[PDB]
Every structure is written in C-alpha cells, then in structure tokens.
C-alpha cells in the first residue's frame, strides 16, 4: 500500500504532465497521495495563472464576514457577522491596518503559535465565497474555471443526466481568517490555488480516520452534536493541533504559499488559517473514485448547513432514501 503513514505529499509535475488534469490526479492517487486527505502541487516554472494581479482592486466583496469566536483558545466556534460591502482595494487596506495586520514573527511556526494562542481575542474579516475567477482565459492547464463538471462526471459514471452547474469561488483573506473543520459538500474533492499574497496554513485528518475526528468533535461540542448528527457540515468548529494531539487524533499540517495548488480528497477533514492579506480560488470536482464517497456522505438536515442548487441532484440520485429528509432541511 502506497503512503501507509498518510503523509502529505508534494508534487512537481513537468509542463507535459500538467496538460491532462484528470490523468495527474489519478497519478497522485497511484502514489498514495489521497491517504493524507491533502496534497500540494507546485506548477512547472513555465506556467502562470495570469499575467499580473495589478488590476484586481475593483472586484467587490458584497458581504464581508467578521469571524467572531466563542470558547477557549484551542476549542472554539466562530459565527459570521455580515459587514457592509467593500472593494478588494478597500479590503487590502483594512487587512494592512494596525488593527488587522500580521504581527512581527520569526517563521511560520512562530506565527502558528501566535494564531492558536490569540485567535479567539480578535475578529478578522474574511471575503469568502465570491463567485468568479482570476485565471486568464488563455491559461490552458489547471485553469479552475475550465475543469470537467461534477454533473458530467456523474453522467459519465452512472448514465443519468442531471441539472446543475459547477463554478469557482474567490476568497480574500487577512491575518487570522479561519476555515473551520469540514469535508466538502457530498465529500467531493476540492482544489485551491493561492493566487497572491501571504500564506495559508492547513491541517488535515486522513480520510480513513475521519470518524475519529467526528467522535472528538461530538465530545467537545456537546450542544451542537445534540442539535445535528452532522454538525461539522455547519463549518463553525475549530480544534487546535495541541488538542488533537492530546486526544490521539491522527493529522498533518502544511503551509501553502502563493503560486501553489492544494487538493483535498474525498472525506479529508481540513481546517486552517491565513497569515495575512491573500487571495485564493477554489472549486469542487469529482473523479470516478468519488462516487462511492458521495453515496455514503453524511448529511445535515437540521436546516443550518444550507447549500448550493447543484447539491439537490447529487442527493437525489446518490442518496434517494435520504432525499426527502434532506430537502425538508433545505426548505
Ligand atoms: O481557503 C479557504 O478559506 C477554505 N478552502 C477550502 O476549504 C478548500 O479549498 O477546500
Ligand atoms: Mg478590479
Ligand atoms: Ni474545503
Ligand atoms: Zn445541521
């Protein structure tokens, strides 16, 4: 069995290997990359996402989110308070202000220490989940706006044509902006490209051990767990690496820098934080190997998780027994 310790693998495809996206994912899996739940892909030196980032300041962040924490430093939830619209130029200036800017630090490990010690005492503002793309239309390789759709994959594997669309999302971050522990909708893959700015630190639990994280989370968030049998779908719970280690949960960590891709694999729980002002693009995708994960994915039906239009068909075709109850949650 390849990668039996479930380590995060880093890949350096050549320009020739970067042509065929599906083939390269399957290659990474042949080497055991999926066992970690997360892989890093460094593009060939010949590749670029677009020519420059000099002209992005007028993008609108219609609903910036202030991430307010509750709990203790290593075990907390966050809620998202909606703020007034602002441009990416306005958000960048806010991120660099004395109130929000990255503190002085020695290295990524010092900054990680500072994150976990102090995150709860601040409320950073995240520009998340903005439909759009920063890839140039002429970028032919690993262009996250031109990937094969999940609807087309389901149709190719299973024979059933379904409604829905699959487009990317932009994320504008600042110091301490946080992504809570989650797997993707319907335990899909995700791919994330860090276009510009400061790094993003990731934590990940191997898919084979995801239920260990779930059991810990039920213990640590006992009210939330009574409310919903899949409350990590709400994307609000944080658990620190120190707490994970104290409870014997297998995990790994890695820092993504500008110009690098990360892929998350089906049922790979992940969480993390941004180091300073940055912009990332991400989208969900599927392969043949996803189908079995999609059929078994948990679902939130309490009403909280509320998701995209295209999840309807995935539930309806892959999980017809759950469909009625899940759809009640959506209405
Ligand atoms: O970058 C973020 O805030 C969160 N991203 C992801 O969870 C992802 O790409 O799957
Ligand atoms: Mg602009
Ligand atoms: Ni994710
Ligand atoms: Zn729920």
Q: Which atom of ligand 1 is nearest to the CA of 126?
A: 3
Tokens found for residue 297: 């994915």
Q: b/e for 256-273, b at 16 or more Cβ within 10 A?
A: bebebbbbbbbbbbbbbb
Experimental method, per PDB record: X-ray
Q: Which residue positions form the known binding site for Fe cation?
A: 182, 184, 270
Burial class (CB in 10 A: 0-12, 13-18, 19+), 4: exposed
Among 124, 128, 168, 179, the mutation site with the greatest number of ligand 1 atoms within 8 A of its Cβ is: 179
- Å resolution of this model? 1.3
Q: Which atom of ligand 1 is nearest to the CA of 264?
A: 10
CA distances from 181 to 48, 139, 159, 216, 269 (A): 31, 32, 33, 12, 6
User: Which bound ligand lies closest to the C-alpha atom of 171?
Assistant: 1
User: Which bound ligand lies closest to the C-alpha atom of 191?
Assistant: 1
* Binding site membership of 271 for ligand 1 (Cβ less than 6 Å): no
Are 158 and 317 within 8 A, CB to CB? yes
Say how many Å lie between the CA of residue 190 and the centre of ligand 3: 6
Tell me which residue has tokens 């004395």: 98
* Binding site membership of 179 for ligand 1 (Cβ less than 6 Å): yes
Tell me the C-alpha distance between 234 and 244, whole Å.
Answer: 20
Tell me the C-alpha distance between 79 and 69, whole Å.
Answer: 7
* Binding site membership of 192 for ligand 1 (Cβ less than 6 Å): yes
Per-chain residues with Cβ under 5 A from ion ligand 2 = 56, 58-59
- CA-closest candidate to residue 268, choices 202, 327, 326, 224: 202
* Binding site membership of 264 for ligand 1 (Cβ less than 6 Å): yes
Say how many Å lie between the CA of residue 128 and the centre of ligand 1: 9
Report domain extents, the chain. 1-331
Residue nearest to atom 4 of ligand 1 (CA): 179
Tokens found for residue 129: 């989940």
Q: Phi and psi (nearest 5°) for 328?
A: -50, -45
Sequence-separated (6 or more) residues with CB below 8 Å from residue 251? 203, 204, 205, 206, 241, 244
Query: What CATH class does 1-331 carry?
Result: mainly beta
Among 176, 233, 277, 282, the mutation site with the greatest number of ligand 1 atoms within 8 A of its Cβ is: 282
Tell me the C-alpha distance between 146 and 289, whole Å.
Answer: 21
Tell me which residue has tokens 């902006």: 177
Sequence-separated (6 or more) residues with CB below 8 Å from residue 1? 32
Residue nearest to atom 10 of ligand 1 (CA): 190
Tokens found for residue 312: 């309807």
Say how many Å lie between the CA of residue 237 and the centre of ligand 3: 13
Q: Which atom of ligand 1 is nearest to the CA of 184?
A: 10
Tell me the C-alpha distance between 68 and 71, whole Å.
Answer: 10
């Amino acid at each position: 069995a390849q990668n039996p310790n479930c380590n995060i693998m880093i890949f350096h495809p050549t320009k020739e290997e970067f042509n065929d996206f599906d083939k390269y994912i399957a290659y990474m899996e042949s080497q055991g990359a999926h066992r970690a739940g997360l892989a890093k892909i460094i593009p060939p030196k010949e590749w670029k996402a677009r020519e420059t980032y000099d002209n992005i300041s007028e993008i609108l962040i219609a609903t910036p989110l202030q991430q307010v924490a509750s709990g203790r430093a290593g075990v907390f939830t966050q809620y998202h308070k909606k703020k007034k619209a602002m441009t990416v130029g306005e958000y960048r200036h806010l991120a660099n202000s004395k109130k929000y800017q990255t503190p002085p630090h020695q290295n990524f490990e010092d900054l990680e220490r500072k994150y976990w010690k102090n995150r709860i005492y601040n409320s950073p503002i995240y520009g998340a989940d903005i439909s759009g793309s920063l890839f140039d239309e002429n970028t032919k390789q690993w262009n996250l706006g031109h990937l094969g759709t999940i609807q087309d994959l389901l149709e190719k594997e299973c024979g059933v044509v379904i409604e829905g669309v699959n487009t990317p999302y932009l994320y504008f971050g600042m110091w301490k902006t946080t992504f809570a522990w989650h797997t993707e909708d319907m335990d899909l893959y995700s791919i994330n490209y860090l276009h510009l700015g400061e790094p993003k630190t990731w934590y990940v639990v191997p898919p084979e051990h995801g239920q260990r994280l779930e059991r810990l989370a039920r213990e640590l968030f006992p009210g939330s767990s009574r409310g919903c049998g899949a409350f990590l779908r709400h994307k609000v719970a944080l658990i620190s690496p120190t707490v994970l280690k104290e409870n014997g949960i297998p995990f790994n960590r890695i820092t993504q820098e500008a110009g690098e891709f990360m892929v998350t694999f089906p049922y790979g729980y992940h969480a993390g934080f941004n180091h300073g002002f940055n912009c990332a693009e991400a989208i969900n995708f599927a392969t043949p190997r996803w189908i079995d994960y999609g059929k078994m994915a948990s679902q939130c039906s309490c009403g909280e998780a509320r998701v995209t239009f295209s999840m309807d068909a995935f539930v309806r075709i892959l999980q017809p027994e759950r469909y009625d109850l899940w759809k009640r949650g959506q209405d």
